[PDB]
Design a protein around this ligand. Structure first.
Ligand code: 9N7
Lengths: 230, 12
């Protein structure tokens, strides 16, 4: 029912690692500062995502057992989770409490960023759905670790080796849900269900980027490796 | 090819 010493150690270690991320307030201030053109917004997106992927590699390498995995499987896990991890992190940032009216302004600024309307609604539907779950920092950090260590990813040669790394994290998350949300026993299943919605954004990320209302879609060599873009 | 990812994952 309660966490074991090994589990508390693992949880705290995932937490230290996750807290190395850029401050949510730092991100929201850049957006809420002034209304930018779609071109200035796309540039912010590419800068944010470049730093996100760099921080994600460092968090990923600290995941227990990750360094023991085959080098090609390591690349496949990272390439398959980078997009999902940024969307998951964007939902966390979105749902952080701000002074009255600022969350309405942040929503409107994102809606007017340059992204197509066809992608706006499923994006806000996912953020809204995440916010309803009232997730703690521990839950976001574990769910990010679980997303990275998904054996059910394409191009994985040794699925068993990855499943062995994902199981203890699934075990910790399941325990946290039974403790912080005892009135809702379906909470862990709800969280796991969100990961299927995450996968849809990954399937449409290239079209989302190319449909952005800018004259030129300029990327960095690192973003070309993580996104399916030229 | 994933030269940069390969680099970020192998260095210390
Ligand atoms: O952890 C970090 O360091 C770190 C930093 C920034 C962000 N994210 C961002 O900056 C971008 C902003 C949206 C407005 C225009 C500029 C980019 N962003 C997004 C968003 C939108 C589209 C995409 C993609 N479309 C295709 C491929 S990827 C990705 C994200 N959703 C957001 C929700 C928020 F509440 C928010 F404050 C910023 C948000 C996520 C994580």
């Amino acid at each position: 029912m309660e966490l074991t010493p090994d589990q508390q150690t693992l949880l705290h270690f995932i937490m230290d690692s996750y807290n190395k991320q850029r401050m949510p307030q730092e991100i929201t201030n850049k957006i809420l500062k002034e209304a930018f053109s779609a071109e200035e917004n796309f540039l912010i997106l590419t800068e944010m995502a470049t730093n996100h992927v760099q921080v994600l590699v460092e968090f990923t390498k600290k995941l227990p057992g990750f360094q023991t995995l085959d080098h090609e499987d390591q690349i496949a896990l990272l390439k398959g989770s980078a997009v999902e991890a940024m969307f998951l992190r964007s939902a966390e940032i979105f749902n952080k409490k701000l002074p009255s009216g600022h969350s309405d302004l942040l929503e409107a600024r994102i809606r007017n960023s340059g992204i197509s309307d066809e992608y706006i609604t499923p994006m806000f539907s996912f953020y809204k759905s995440i916010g309803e779950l009232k997730m703690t920092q521990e839950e976001y950090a574990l769910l990010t670790a679980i997303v990275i260590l998904s054996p059910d990813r394409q191009y994985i040669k040794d699925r068993e080796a990855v499943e062995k790394l994902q199981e203890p994290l699934l075990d910790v998350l399941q325990k946290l849900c039974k403790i912080h949300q005892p009135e809702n026993p379906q909470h862990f299943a709800c969280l796991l269900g969100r990961l299927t919605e995450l996968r849809t954004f990954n399937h449409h990320h290239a079209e989302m980027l190319m449909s952005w209302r800018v004259n030129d879609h300029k990327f960095t060599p690192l973003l070309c490796e993580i996104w399916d873009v030229q | 090819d994933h030269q940069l990812l390969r680099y970020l994952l192998d260095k210390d």
